[PDB]
Structure formats: C-alpha cells, structure tokens
C-alpha cells in the first residue's frame, strides 16, 4: 500500500543522503608528521623534503 511507497521513498532519501557524505581528507601537517614517521627510509626522505 501507500506505506510501502512511503518506506521506499524514505529508504531512497536515506541512501541519497548517505552517498552525499564527504569525509575530510588529511591536512597539510598530518602528511608531514605521518610520512616522516612512516618508514625508516621515509623519515630520511621527509627530513630531506
């Protein structure tokens, strides 16, 4: 019935909102710290950089 249509519409809206979510990418300083602590050669490469 119309309840089925309402449920389908609500699910579609929920999925559409779920797709539109954006998670912030790592910033400028996180990259520096993490790549300078990632690997033994990576620490030297980041110190050089």
């Amino acid at each position: 019935g119309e309840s089925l249509d309402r449920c389908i519409d609500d699910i579609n809206r929920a999925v559409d909102s779920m797709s539109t979510l954006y998670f912030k990418p790592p910033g400028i300083f996180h990259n520096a710290i993490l790549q300078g602590a990632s690997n033994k050669a990576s620490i030297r490469k980041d110190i050089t950089r």
């Binding site: 019935g1 449920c7 929920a14 909102s17 979510l21 954006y22 910033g27 300083f29 996180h30």
Partner: protein, 91 residues
C-alpha cells in the same frame, strides 16, 4: 493482499534501520572532521617542535639516560646508608 502485508513490516523495519544507520554515519562524519582538526593542530605543533629541534643544539644531552638514572638512585641509596651510619656513630 495479506501476503504483501506480511512483507510490508519487514521492509518497514529495514527502512527504520537504514534511517538510523544514515544518521549514525552523519554523526560519525562529524566525529571524523573533529579528529581531522585535532590531528592538524597537534601535527602543526609537533612539526614546529621538530623543526626547532633540527635547528638548535643542547650541549648536555645525556646518552645512557637509563644508566644515569640507575646510577643516581644507587648513589641516593648509598647516601641514605652514609647518613644512617654517621648519625648512629654520632648518637
């Protein structure tokens, strides 16, 4: 008729669960943004600290700090021994 009715509740709880999951993921996204901001602030502080570290010299940085501290506590204990021994002698 009644059989599509038999189904419809199941899709209804599915809809409820999906809506709850969507809201939970939005809250998790807020938490993720907060974590990113905290990471950026702390990483900036650490980067400044390490840049200054690669730029300054401290002339009395120890090298065997574990040996130094065990030696210090050993000397401390020997000093308590000396103090007990001397105050007994004086007494």
């Amino acid at each position: 008729n009644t059989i599509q009715q038999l189904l419809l509740p199941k899709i209804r709880e599915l809809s409820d669960s999906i809506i709850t999951l969507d809201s939970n993921f939005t809250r998790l996204n807020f938490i993720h943004e907060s974590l990113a901001d905290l990471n950026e602030s702390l990483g900036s502080l650490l980067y400044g600290i390490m840049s200054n570290s690669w730029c300054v010299e401290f002339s009395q940085a120890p090298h065997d700090i574990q040996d130094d501290l065990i030696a210090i506590k050993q000397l401390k204990s020997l000093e308590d021994e000396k103090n007990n021994l001397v105050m007994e002698l004086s007494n």
